[PDB]
């Protein structure tokens, strides 16, 4: 009832598997295979843009896969922000639930990540302000829906030639250089300020040209971090659930927080000030995305009337205990109820 007219599909075998996509999508080219899916770049003849087309690999083989597929579709359908990956399209060749086995997601093509940009030029302080501004603007939006990215790092940030940025590749599970210490060692539950830690690690590296904490294992990584931000105080130790983790931390030679200005000489002092506020060991005391947008570092870009929040995002589905075919059916409904973006 009032369902979209079914496009004409065509089938091609690209590498391992049969791709069946609307004729709208042309000149498909493999861009590599992940654990959960395979990705091609394509020309979207409807919008005139190159896009990423992800074919999920057997999304309904198990509860874990079926729910993961549902999770991803619910998340991409919710997120509508200039600095965040959006769902351009989702389709199946299936004409019914009985024949529904394959899910294709169409999203912003990764033309260049933040590493490609660093590779080919020296960013100005203005480039760094604008890049970090857009990350924080996207994070204000997702955090306002109680979405946590969980895996912010340069390879998950798309950047175009206008230095416009999008947050890509959200963590869908229920290099560590950019991970908050409290999650790297499982000290406590994910809060959204794990993302703020990641932005701090990214900004430091864009300012200096050097990875901030390029540790080789969890221990080496944690010692590099604690050398800069100081060993946990008694107040933080109370909030760590594991006795073993608490015992391990107490085993460490107490270290003072370093003076950041001496680690970042010649950087804009407002940038260093913001870095201080992002890289606080106690996740409760880190600046939030919204606060960070008001920092004087971003005075040139900050507009409180154009830093929007999201609709609330209902994640109560996470506690549902359902059959493969029930997750599959919910996923199918979300394919059916998909409204493409305007224009």
């Amino acid at each position: 009832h009032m369902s979209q007219e079914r496009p004409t599909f065509y089938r091609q075998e690209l590498n391992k598997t049969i791709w069946e996509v609307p004729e709208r999508y042309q000149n498909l080219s493999p861009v590599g295979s992940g654990a959960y899916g395979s990705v091609c770049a394509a020309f979207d003849t409807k919008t005139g843009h190159r896009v990423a087309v992800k074919k999920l690999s057997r999304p309904f083989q198990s509860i874990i896969h079926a729910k993961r597929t549902y999770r991803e579709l619910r998340l991409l359908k919710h997120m509508k922000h200039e600095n965040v990956i959006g769902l351009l399209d989702v389709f199946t060749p299936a004409r019914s639930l009985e024949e529904f086995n394959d899910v294709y997601l169409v999203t912003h093509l990764m033309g260049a990540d933040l590493n490609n940009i660093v590779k080919c030029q020296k960013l100005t302080d203005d480039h760094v302000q604008f890049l970090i501004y857009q990350i924080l603007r996207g994070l204000k939006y997702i955090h306002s829906a109680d979405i946590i990215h969980r895996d912010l790092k340069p390879s998950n940030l798309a950047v175009n030639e206008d230095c416009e940025l999008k947050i890509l590749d959200f963590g869908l599970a229920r290099t560590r250089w950019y991970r908050a210490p409290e999650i790297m060692l499982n000290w406590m539950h994910y809060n959204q300020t794990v993302d703020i830690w990641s932005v701090g690690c990214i900004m430091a590296e864009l300012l200096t040209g050097r990875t901030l904490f390029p540790g080789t294992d969890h221990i080496d990584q944690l010692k590099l971090i604690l050398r800069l931000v100081g060993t946990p105080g008694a107040e933080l130790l109370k909030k760590i659930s594991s006795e073993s983790a608490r015992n391990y931390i107490q085993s460490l030679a107490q270290m003072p927080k370093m003076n950041f200005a001496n680690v970042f000489i010649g950087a804009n002092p407002l940038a260093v000030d913001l870095l201080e506020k992002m890289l606080v060991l106690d996740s409760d005391k880190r600046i939030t995305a919204a606060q960070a947008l008001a920092h004087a570092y971003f005075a040139q870009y900050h507009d409180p009337d154009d830093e929007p929040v999201a609709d609330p995002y209902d994640q109560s589905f996470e506690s549902r205990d359902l059959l493969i075919d029930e997750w599959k059916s919910l996923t199918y409904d979300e394919v059916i109820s998909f409204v493409p973006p305007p224009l």
Binding site: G111, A112, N116, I117, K119, C120, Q121, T124, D126, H127, F130, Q134, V159, N160, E161, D162, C163, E164, Q300, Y301, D303, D306
Partner: peptide
């Protein structure tokens, strides 16, 4: 309104 706010709008190079 973000491109108007930028100090410079010379295109970045994406691959090299």
């Amino acid at each position: 309104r973000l491109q108007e706010r930028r100090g410079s709008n010379v295109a970045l190079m994406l691959d090299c």
